[PDB]
Amino acid sequence: QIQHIAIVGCVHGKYREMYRQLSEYEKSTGKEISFVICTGDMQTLRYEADLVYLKVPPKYKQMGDFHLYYEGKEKAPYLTLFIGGNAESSNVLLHLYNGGFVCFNMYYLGVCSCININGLRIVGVSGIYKSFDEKKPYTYPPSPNDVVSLFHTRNYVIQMLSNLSQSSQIDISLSHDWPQGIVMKGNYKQLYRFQPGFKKDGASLGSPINKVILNTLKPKYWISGHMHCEYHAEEGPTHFIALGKIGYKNAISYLDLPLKQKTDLEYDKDWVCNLIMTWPAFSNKAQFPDLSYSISELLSKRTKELDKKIIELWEKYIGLKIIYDSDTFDIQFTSRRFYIEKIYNEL
């Protein structure tokens, strides 16, 4: 009983090319793709006005294929879970910072979260690291002035995810830029022959935020992109897999993993409790998170019997199944926070 998971690097708005390759493979090899995982740079632009939030050089200010899927004239043939990179419709991803479907079969994991599917636990970390913005809060609603800073990974995601490895093991973890120092743990002399530019950065290459998360959350696999190249490294058990950009046939690999039980996409219980217990830090919708609160010790108020009754209210008001919701992304922002607040205020 085996599931075939398609892992994809940078998409850069070339969705039809990606699904064309995925559809070719499963009818090539006869294998069936369970779901697809993307490592960011999705460019989920709905309409021309969203081009303002895409931080790219002028030669890449393009719509891409996503608007066809948002308009419904194209349909993603596989369930696609993805995180955010640096070339994103940052306004859209800020509305869905708690996750959400940008269209049918395309689920955004949020700023960071953990999900359940087919007995696996999958963690995502969006954005790329820039030191001068790691402690900077988000401002809502999204403004065109924040195009340069919205896609930067915030430091607080380290404390939002640190406890996820306590109850069980993390199977797959996602980041866009590489975990800092992971370049030192594979065939780097061959990688430097691909790009001698990476030799300048050396061991300091990558995100230090993802390095802390990688060493803490223990995962079996860590898949990243951003670098537009293939690379595999090993640090402890973690099979590090870097993928390239769509258009080059080094972007899509496949994880042939054991299938415990075919199970629908669901919210991770431990993450749901972390999300509720941290609501005081996110209570101000205009600016979050309020780092005057301690995210690490807000989570210390979790107990076994309190966790199990957060789940009941979540299953009542939201549901354990992650289902498609076609409401506008600004409405989904208010709705998800509305029930997060309601669940918290009932404990």
Nearer to Fe ion by C-beta: 41 or 50?
A: 41
Q: How far is the CB of 311 from Fe ion (least distance, A)?
A: 36
Q: How far is the CB of 151 from Fe ion (least distance, A)?
A: 9
Nearer to Fe ion by C-beta: 21 or 86?
A: 86
> In angstroms, rounded to a whole number, what is the distance separating the alpha carbons of residues 337 and 294?
20
Task: Please identify, among the stretches 62-70, 161-169, 183-191, 219-227, the one whose residues bind Fe ion according to the rule CB under 5 A.
Answer: 219-227
Nearer to Fe ion by C-beta: 36 or 277?
A: 36
Residue 240's identity, in one-letter code, is F
Q: How far is the CB of 177 from Fe ion (least distance, A)?
A: 7
> In angstroms, rounded to a whole number, what is the distance separating the alpha carbons of residues 131 and 136?
10
Task: Please identify, among the stretches 22-30, 41-49, 118-126, 248-256, the one whose residues bind Fe ion according to the rule CB under 5 A.
Answer: 41-49
Report the partner that residue 39 touches, choosing among Fe ion, Zn ion, none (CB closer than 5 to 8 A by kind): none
Nearer to Zn ion by C-beta: 6 or 87?
A: 87
> In angstroms, rounded to a whole number, what is the distance separating the alpha carbons of residues 236 and 218?
9
CB 289 within 8 A of CB 278: yes
Q: How far is the CB of 139 from Zn ion (least distance, A)?
A: 26
What's the chain's length in residues?
347
Q: How far is the CB of 226 from Fe ion (least distance, A)?
A: 4
CB 112 within 8 A of CB 123: yes
- Helix then strand count (H, E) for the chain reads 11, 15
C-alpha to C-alpha distances, 4 to 25, 208, 232, nearest whole angstrom: 11, 31, 19
124, containing H or E segment: strand 120-125
Nearer to Zn ion by C-beta: 41 or 65?
A: 41
Q: What is the three-class DSSP state of 341?
A: helix
Which residues 6+ apart lie within 8 Å of 309 measured at CB?
347
CB 221 within 8 A of CB 170: no
Q: How far is the CB of 51 from Zn ion (least distance, A)?
A: 17
Report the partner that residue 86 touches, choosing among Zn ion, Fe ion, none (CB closer than 5 to 8 A by kind): Fe ion
Residue among 21, 22, 33, 41 that touches Fe ion (CB under 5 A): 41
Number of residues that bind Fe ion (CB under 5 A): 4
206 binds Fe ion (CB under 5 A): no
CB 7 within 8 A of CB 52: no
Contacts with Zn ion, residue ranges (CB under 5 A):
10, 41
Q: Across the strands, what pairs with 117?
A: 120
Residue among 9, 13, 85, 99 that touches Fe ion (CB under 5 A): 85
Task: Please identify, among the stretches 85-93, 179-187, 295-303, 335-343, the one whose residues bind Fe ion according to the rule CB under 5 A.
Answer: 85-93
What is 88-113 written as a DSSP string? S-HHHHHHTTT-EEEETTEEE--SEE
Q: Tell me how many degrees the CA angle 227-56-174 measures, rounded to the nearest 5.
A: 40
226 binds Fe ion (CB under 5 A): yes
Report the partner that residue 289 touches, choosing among Fe ion, Zn ion, none (CB closer than 5 to 8 A by kind): none
Q: How far is the CB of 336 from Fe ion (least distance, A)?
A: 27
Question: Which residue's CB atom is positioned nearest to Zn ion?
Answer: 10
Report the partner that residue 270 touches, choosing among Fe ion, Zn ion, none (CB closer than 5 to 8 A by kind): none
70, containing H or E segment: helix 66-70
Q: How far is the CB of 26 from Fe ion (least distance, A)?
A: 27
Task: Please identify, among the stretches 56-64, 86-94, 155-163, 164-172, the one whose residues bind Fe ion according to the rule CB under 5 A.
Answer: 86-94
Parallel/antiparallel/unpaired status of strands 138-139 and 112-117:
unpaired
127 binds Fe ion (CB under 5 A): no
What is the Cα gyration radius of the chain?
19
**Residues found near Fe ion in the complex (CB under 5 A):** 41, 85-86, 226
